[PDB]
Write a protein that binds this ligand. Structure first.
Ligand code: ATP
Ligand code: ATP
Ligand code: XAN
Ligand code: CA
Ligand code: ZN
Ligand code: ZN
Lengths: 184, 96, 362, 145, 48
C-alpha cells in the first residue's frame, strides 16, 4: 500500500519505479486485496484512499445473490435517480448488499464429442482422398498422356476436383450420421 | 420504450461512470482510460468494500481519511464522495 | 512437360479467379432462364407423367442444355472461389494462429479452451512443416522457440511446435542441399503435407461461403435428377442484392426475441385451447351436413391444431369460424373468450412479431 | 392529349382530375412517396414474387388435390393443374385473402398431408401476409413521413 | 407528436428555468441547485 501510494503520487521519479520492479511480485500478489477509491478530502482536494479487500467478501460479491441485486439497483438508479437521490440510493444499496452478503456467507457451508467425431470424419475422408495416391494410379494415366492434350488435361483436373466435391459430400454424410447417432 | 430505456441504461453505463459522472471522453485520451477509471479509480465494488472495511475496523484504529468518511457517513453527508471530479482531473496539470 | 502441366493449370486457375464474379452473375442468369423455361411446365393425365408443354416447341432441348450449362458454370464458380478467396481466409487464420501462438502462447503457456472448434482445429497446423505457408516468414517457429522453449522445456516444446534444435544449429552451420525435380512425383508428394492439407481443407469446409457454394452445387446436381430443384437457385438473388440481404438478415437480427414471441403466442394459444377443451367443446363442430359431425376439439391435439392453424389466420379471432354462441348459457363467457383471443392473439403479439421484424429491417 | 381525346370520349376527361395532386403540396408529397422509396419497393415486390413462386411450386408438386374451386361436384375447376394458373391463384386472391392461401383452399383435415398442409399455409400467412406486405406498407408510409 | 410535445414541455421545465433559461447543469454543482433556483432565486410565483 505504501509503495502504491508513493508511485501514484510521484510517477516521475525513476528510483521509485526501480523499487517497483524490485517488488513487482509483491504488488501483483496484493493487487486483488488492495482497494483504491477517490474521496473528497477535508482540505478541498481529491485524495486517493487505500484499504484491504477480503477474499471472502470478494467471493460473496461474485455470488449471484449480489449480481441480481446490483442489476436491479443499477437499473433503478440510472432511470429514476436524481442528483442527490442517486447517491443516497447508492449508500442504501451498499448497506443492503452488506447485509445480504453477510447472509450469503452465513448460508454457505463447508461439444467434446462433436469436435471429436468431426476429427474422425475429416481424417477418414481425407485419408480416403489420398488412398488414390496410395494406390498410385496417376502414374499410369501420366504415361498415357505423355503427349500434349489440353482437353484431356482439363478433363483430368475436373475429375480430381469433381471427386474433391464428392469427398465434401462424404464428409457431410458422415457429419449427418454422427448427428443421428448422438440424437438417437 | 421499455426496450429503449434498457438500452439507454446500458449505454449510459458505457459512456459515463456512476461515482462522479465524468463521461468516458476525458478518460479516453489514454488507452483503456474509462475501463481503468471503472475498475480501480471509481469502482462501485471498491466503494462498497471500503464501507465494509470501515464497519469491520475498530473505532480506535481508523485513520484520518477513514474517520472523516465514517463521521460524514454517520451524519449522512455525501460530500466526501467525488462530484464531477477525480484524482486524474484534480492533478491533471501535474500528472499530465 | 511437367512445366506445361503446371503452366496450363496455373493459367486456368488464374482465368477462373479473374472471372469468378462475372461467372457467378452468368450462373444467376442461367438459373433465371431455367426457371422461366419451367414457367411453362404442365401435368398430363396411375403414374402422372409430368410433361413440359412447349408453346414454340423448343423448350425441352433448351432446358437440357441450360441445366448442363448451369452445372458447368457453378462448378467453375467453385473453382474460381477456391482460387480467389480461399487463400485469403487461410492467410487470415494463419496470422491469427501464429499470433496467439507467439504473443499469447495459446498452445504452450495455456491450452485451448476445448470448447472452440477453431482452437481444436488449429492445434493440428502447429506441427505441420508448411506452417506460415502464406503468412510471410517461416521463422515464427524459431521465435516461439526462443520465447517459450527454455522456460517450459526445449525438447517437448520442439516436439509440439514441429522443429528440432539440430536444424536450428544446422541453420548457422554449413549446409548442402539437393534441388527438387519436377519430374519426380514422389518429391512433390513428400513436399505436400498430409497434416497441412488436413488443416487447409478443414478450414475451407468450415468457411461459410464455400458451404453456400456447395449447397448451390448439390441443388444443381439434384436439379439434374428433378428439374424443379433448380428453383432453389433463384434464392441467389437475395445474396446478389444488398437490399435483399438486409431483408433476409432482418429475421436473424431480432430472431431471438422473435423465437421468444412465437413461444409466448404458443403459450397463449395453449391456454385458450385448454379453456375451450374444458368448457367450449360443443361449439367446435365444423361439419356442414348434420348427419356426421366433425368434432374438432374432442382431442386437444386436434384442438390446438384448430387454434394455431386457422384461428390466428382467421383475421378476427377464433370467434369467426366457431359457431355462433347466441342463446347458450355460456354466452357471455364465450363472448369474453373470443374477444380476449382477438385482442391478445390477433391485435397483440402478431403486431409484436410484425413490428419486431420491420423494426430490425429499419 | 387527354382533353382532345375526351372530346372523342367524354370519360377521358376524368384523367384531368389527377391534376389536384399537382395542385396541392400534400398530394404531391403522397404521390412522390411511391417514387422516393420506389427502388426498394420494386425489390420488395420482386421478393414477394419469389416467395409466392416457391409456394406455388410446392403446392404444384404436392398439394394439387386441394385446389378445386368448383361448388358443384359434376365439373371440377382444377386451379393448380397448370402452374401459370396456380401462380395466378396465389398472386391474385391469396395475397388478398387476408389470412393466407389457407382460407380459400379446401380444408386439409383428415388427409395424410395434414401437418404439411398446416405448416405450408401458416408459413404462407406469416411470410406473405404478415411479412413483406407490412414491409411494403411501412416502406411507403415511412417515405411519406 | 402531441404526446411528444407534452413530454418535451415537461422535460424542458425539468432541465431549464423559465425566467432566465439557464439549464439545470450549472445549478447542479451544488446540491438541489436547480430546485433552489426555481423556488427562491427564479420563481414565477415570486415574480407575480
Ligand atoms: N462506475 C462504474 N463502475 C463499474 N463499472 C462501470 C462504471 N462505469 C461504467 N462501468 C462499466 O460497467 C461494466 C461493469 O459494471 P456492471 O457490473 O454494471 O456490468 P456487467 O458487465 O454486467 O458486470 P458483471 O458481469 O460483473 O455483472 C463495464 O463495462 C464497465 O466499463
Ligand atoms: N422557473 C421555474 N419556476 C418554477 N418551477 C420551475 C422553474 N423551472 C423549473 N421548474 C420546475 O417546475 C416544477 C414546479 O413548477 P410547476 O408549477 O410548473 O410544476 P408542478 O410540479 O406541476 O407544480 P404544482 O404542483 O404547484 O402545480 C418543479 O419541478 C420545478 O423544479
Ligand atoms: O512484418 C511483416 N508483416 C507482413 O505481413 C509481411 N509480409 C511480408 N513481409 C512482412 N513483414
Ligand atoms: Ca489512534
Ligand atoms: Zn468517476
Ligand atoms: Zn433562471
Amino acid at each position: 500500500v505504501l509503495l502504491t501510494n508513493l508511485s501514484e503520487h510521484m510517477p516521475n521519479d525513476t528510483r521509485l519505479q526501480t523499487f517497483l520492479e524490485l517488488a513487482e511480485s509483491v504488488l501483483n500478489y496484493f493487487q486483488p486485496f488492495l482497494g483504491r477509491i477517490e474521496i473528497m478530502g477535508s482540505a478541498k482536494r481529491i485524495e486517493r484512499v487505500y484499504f484491504e479487500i477480503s477474499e471472502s467478501s470478494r467471493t460473496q460479491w461474485e455470488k449471484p445473490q449480489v449480481k441480481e441485486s446490483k442489476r436491479q439497483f443499477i437499473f433503478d438508479v440510472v432511470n429514476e435517480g436524481g442528483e442527490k437521490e442517486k447517491m443516497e440510493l447508492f449508500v442504501n444499496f451498499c448497506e443492503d448488499t452488506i447485509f445480504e452478503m453477510q447472509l450469503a456467507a452465513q448460508i454457505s457451508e463447508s461439444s467434446i464429442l462433436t469436435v471429436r467425431s468431426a476429427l474422425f470424419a475429416l481424417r477418414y475422408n481425407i485419408l480416403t482422398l489420398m488412398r488414390m495416391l496410395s494406390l498410385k494410379s496417376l502414374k499410369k494415366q501420366m504415361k498415357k498422356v505423355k503427349k500434349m492434350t489440353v482437353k484431356d488435361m482439363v478433363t483430368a483436373f475436373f475429375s480430381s476436383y469433381w471427386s474433391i466435391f464428392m469427398t465434401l459430400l462424404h464428409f457431410v454424410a458422415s457429419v449427418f450420421r454422427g448427428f443421428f447417432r448422438i440424437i438417437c | 420504450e421499455l426496450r429503449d430505456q434498457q438500452e439507454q441504461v446500458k449505454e449510459d453505463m458505457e459512456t459515463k461512470c456512476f461515482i462522479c459522472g465524468i463521461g468516458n471522453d476525458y478518460f479516453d485520451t489514454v488507452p483503456h482510460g474509462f475501463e481503468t477509471h471503472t475498475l480501480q479509480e471509481h469502482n462501485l465494488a471498491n466503494y462498497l468494500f471500503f464501507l465494509m472495511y470501515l464497519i469491520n475496523k475498530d473505532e480506535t484504529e481508523h485513520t484520518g481519511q477513514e474517520s472523516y468518511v465514517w463521521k460524514m457517513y454517520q451524519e449522512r453527508c455525501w460530500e466526501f464522495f467525488p462530484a464531477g471530479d477525480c484524482f486524474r482531473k484534480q492533478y491533471e496539470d501535474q500528472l499530465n | 512437360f511437367w512445366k506445361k502441366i503446371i503452366a496450363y493449370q496455373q493459367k486456368l486457375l488464374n482465368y477462373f479467379a479473374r472471372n469468378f464474379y462475372n461467372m457467378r452473375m452468368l450462373a444467376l442468369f442461367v438459373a433465371f432462364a431455367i426457371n422461366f423455361i419451367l414457367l411453362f411446365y404442365k401435368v398430363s393425365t396411375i403414374a402422372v407423367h409430368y410433361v413440359l408443354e412447349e408453346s414454340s416447341g423448343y423448350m425441352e432441348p433448351t432446358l437440357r442444355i441450360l441445366a448442363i450449362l448451369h452445372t458447368v458454370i457453378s462448378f467453375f464458380c467453385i473453382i474460381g472461389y477456391y482460387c480467389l478467396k480461399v487463400p485469403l481466409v487461410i492467410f487470415k487464420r494463419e496470422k491469427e494462429v501464429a499470433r496467439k501462438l507467439e504473443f499469447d502462447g495459446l498452445y504452450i503457456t495455456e491450452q485451448p479452451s476445448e470448447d472452440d472448434i477453431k482452437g481444436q482445429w488449429d492445434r493440428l497446423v502447429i506441427n505441420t512443416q508448411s506452417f506460415p505457408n502464406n503468412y510471410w516468414d517461416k521463422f515464427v517457429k524459431r521465435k516461439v522457440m526462443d520465447k517459450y522453449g527454455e522456460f517450459y522445456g526445449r525438447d517437448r516444446i520442439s516436439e509440439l511446435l514441429g522443429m528440432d534444435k539440430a536444424a536450428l544449429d544446422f541453420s548457422d552451420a554449413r549446409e548442402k542441399k539437393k534441388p527438387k525435380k519436377d519430374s519426380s512425383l514422389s518429391a512433390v508428394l513428400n513436399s505436400i503435407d498430409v497434416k497441412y492439407q488436413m488443416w487447409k481443407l478443414g478450414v475451407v469446409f468450415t468457411d461459410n461461403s464455400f458451404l453456400y457454394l456447395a449447397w448451390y452445387m448439390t441443388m444443381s446436381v439434384l436439379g439434374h435428377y428433378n428439374n424443379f430443384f433448380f428453383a432453389a437457385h433463384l434464392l441467389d438473388i437475395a445474396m446478389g442484392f444488398k437490399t435483399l440481404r438486409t431483408i433476409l438478415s432482418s429475421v436473424t437480427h431480432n430472431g431471438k426475441q422473435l423465437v421468444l414471441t412465437v413461444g409466448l403466442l404458443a403459450v397463449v394459444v395453449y391456454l385458450y385451447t385448454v379453456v375451450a377443451f374444458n368448457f367450449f367443446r360443443k361449439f367446435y363442430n365444423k361439419s356442414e351436413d348434420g348427419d356426421t359431425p366433425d368434432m374438432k376439439c374432442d382431442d386437444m391435439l386436434t384442438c390446438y391444431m384448430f387454434h394455431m392453424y386457422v384461428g390466428v389466420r382467421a383475421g378476427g379471432g377464433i370467434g369467426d369460424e366457431i359457431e355462433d354462441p347466441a342463446g347458450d348459457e355460456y354466452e357471455i363467457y364465450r363472448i369474453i373468450f373470443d374477444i380476449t383471443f382477438f385482442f391478445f392473439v390477433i391485435v397483440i403479439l402478431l403486431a409484436i412479431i410484425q413490428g419486431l421484424i420491420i423494426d430490425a429491417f429499419g
